[PDB]
C-alpha cells in the first residue's frame, strides 16, 4: 500500500486545496501549509473532519482518514 | 449569454442561451441530460423560485450567472 494519501481542504467560499501527506505525519504540517497558501494564521481558522476538531498532533492514521477525504476549514472571526 | 446550472451532485452544467428565450427550454434540457424530471426538481435564482416562462432578461440575468437545482418538497 501507499505510505501517503491525498486530503482536501474545503472553505466556505467553495475553494478546495489538495495535499499529499504521509499517513503518520502530524496534520499540523497540512494546516500550516494551508495557512501559508491562504496567507492566514493558525488562530484565525479551525479544521474539522467528520464534525470533530483536528488537533495539531492528530495524524491521518489516528483519525482513521482515507484517500480523498475532505477537511472543512472555518474562519473564527465575527463582526460586532 | 452563458448560464451555469449548479446541481446537488457536486457538478455544474453550463448552457448558452439567448437573452429572451424562456428558461423552460433550459430546464427540460438539464433534466434531459441528468435523466431527471421536473416534478421532482425545482429551480431558483438568487433565492427566488423560477417560473418556466421567465427569460434571462426580466430576471436581470447576466453572463455566467448560476441557476440552483433543488429536490421538490414540503413539510407536514
Amino acid at each position: 500500500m501507499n505510505d501517503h494519501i491525498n486530503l482536501k481542504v474545503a472553505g466556505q467560499d467553495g475553494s478546495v486545496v489538495q495535499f499529499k501527506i504521509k499517513r503518520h505525519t502530524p496534520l499540523s504540517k497540512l494546516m500550516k501549509a494551508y495557512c501559508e497558501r491562504q496567507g492566514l494564521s493558525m488562530r484565525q481558522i479551525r479544521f474539522r473532519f467528520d464534525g470533530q476538531p483536528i488537533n495539531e498532533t492528530d495524524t491521518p492514521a489516528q483519525l482513521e482518514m482515507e484517500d480523498e477525504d475532505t477537511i472543512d476549514v472555518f474562519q473564527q472571526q465575527t463582526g460586532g | 449569454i452563458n448560464l451555469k446550472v449548479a446541481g446537488q451532485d457536486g457538478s455544474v452544467v453550463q448552457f448558452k442561451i439567448k437573452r429572451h428565450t424562456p428558461l423552460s427550454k433550459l430546464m427540460k434540457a438539464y433534466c434531459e441530460r441528468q435523466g431527471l424530471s421536473m416534478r421532482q426538481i425545482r429551480f431558483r435564482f438568487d433565492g427566488q423560485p423560477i417560473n418556466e416562462t421567465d427569460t434571462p432578461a426580466q430576471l436581470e440575468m447576466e453572463d455566467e450567472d448560476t441557476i440552483d437545482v433543488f429536490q421538490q418538497q414540503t413539510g407536514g
Binding site: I21, A33 | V12, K16, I17
Partner: peptide, 21 residues
C-alpha cells in the same frame, strides 16, 4: 435554441501541494 458548453466540478481542486518530504 440551446447549446451545451461544459460540465465540470462545482468545487474543483484549485491547487495541489506536496507535504511528502
Amino acid at each position: 435554441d440551446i447549446q451545451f458548453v461544459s460540465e465540470g466540478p462545482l468545487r474543483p481542486v484549485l491547487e495541489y501541494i506536496d507535504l511528502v518530504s
